[PDB]
Amino acid sequence: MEGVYFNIDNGFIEGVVRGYRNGLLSNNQYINLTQCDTLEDLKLQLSSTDYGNFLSSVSSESLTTSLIQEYASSKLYHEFNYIRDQSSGSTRKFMDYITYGYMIDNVALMITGTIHDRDKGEILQRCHPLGWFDTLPTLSVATDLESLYETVLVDTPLAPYFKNCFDTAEELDDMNIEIIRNKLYKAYLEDFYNFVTEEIPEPAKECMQTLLGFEADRRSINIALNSLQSSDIDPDLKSDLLPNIGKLYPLATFHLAQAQDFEGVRAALANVYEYRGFLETGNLEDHFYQLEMELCRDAFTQQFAISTVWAWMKSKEQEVRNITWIAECIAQNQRERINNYISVY
């Protein structure tokens, strides 16, 4: 399984990836900080963790919402862009392929937001291979597909956003952000299945295949639950392809995605994950957060594996979203209702 191959860059990349994950905050710090409500106590309590360097670099006498996104955005550049510059080979190619996979939808959100008068400085923090000072300003400001093809081709290696830009150049995906986000999520899952199929048999991957398979059905159920009561098109690409072909079908996800009261397919697919058939978005998001948190804590302790790099990459975005929601909830002088249940998973 694992520990039978020799990887020089995988040991330094796994140790450098585990070193930032070991110094990060835990569920006890989020549960303790979520109970307290004070702007001065949040800066002192958050200073002990790994975010105390970025939060301590710029701070004022009051809690601001701009410093919370700048702290996670500053920590994401050193946590993601710093490892790619010191690595090379198939590990840096797969790590750049994951950042290109998140940048396929993250760059698509800025490209769709470019028509709404949005720039590089008006976008939130997201996972990418580099910061928004080299590729994010020209890619976000560039609205033509010819400039995005040369901008994506200028980066090394080739990313999967060229096929999505070529399919989106002819208007083959959608005219809204819903169909482009669903087709970009399905193309990102197909690219993650392509890299996970390519660099699969280096080690013995057990939690990564179950986390990707459960994340595909959780992403399809989240995409169908997000378009519930929105009048989605059944003949449109909104059903992400999963590895299951006997439990979850595309007709059940397309029929359940429409506002027809067809959530019984989630109850039939239930009994194996944290999700279940209901009509509450907060309970489905809290069950999806606990279902996505399962198999994620095992990657933070196991070493010499390729699934721990993707599990730490998703755990950095989930911990950045939970820390941003926890800091944004206490920054406005309010108590969290949906973020409090999803504060520990």
């Binding site: 520990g3 140790g15 585990r18 994950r21 070991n22 933070f300 196991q302 070493q303």
Partner: protein, 147 residues
């Protein structure tokens, strides 16, 4: 001169298995933020347990090298039994070290996760040490029945 290849290659698999088991067991002792209570409290048994696999192949290689001589019965040719005798302990020591490394990494990873399943990793990890003894016992029994 063909009989020395089994004694020289006897502990080569036990040393590589114990090295990969000690490296794989020691690699999982990084996390997760607690060093006083549980790391290392009972997780040091796989690293010290995996190092004993090389002593069986080393003692078996020293006993097999000291047992054979150039002035003894070596005109058979019967010197092929030393290769199976050394490789039998080397494969069992390598498989025991490889299973001991994954059992130590899984016990060290599952130890800090739950505070109630700590005895299961020690009880399941304690049974993996008996794998390498069969190749050393068969190597000593094969060396005792020869010249």
């Amino acid at each position: 001169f063909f009989g020395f290849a089994g004694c020289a290659a006897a502990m080569v698999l036990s040393c590589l298995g114990a090295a990969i088991g000690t490296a794989k067991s020691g690699i999982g002792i990084a996390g997760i933020g607690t060093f006083k209570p549980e790391l290392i409290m009972k997780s040091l048994i796989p690293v010290v347990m995996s190092g004993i696999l090389a002593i069986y192949g080393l003692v078996v290689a020293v006993l097999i090298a000291g047992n054979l001589s150039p002035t003894e019965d070596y005109t058979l040719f019967n010197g092929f039994m030393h290769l199976s005798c050394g490789l039998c302990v080397g494969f069992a020591c390598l498989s025991s070290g490889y299973a001991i490394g994954m059992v130590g990494d899984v016990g060290v990873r599952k130890y800090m996760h739950q505070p109630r399943l700590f005895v299961g990793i020690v009880l399941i990890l304690i049974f993996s040490e008996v794998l390498g003894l069969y190749g050393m016992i068969v190597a000593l029994i094969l060396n005792t029945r020869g010249s």
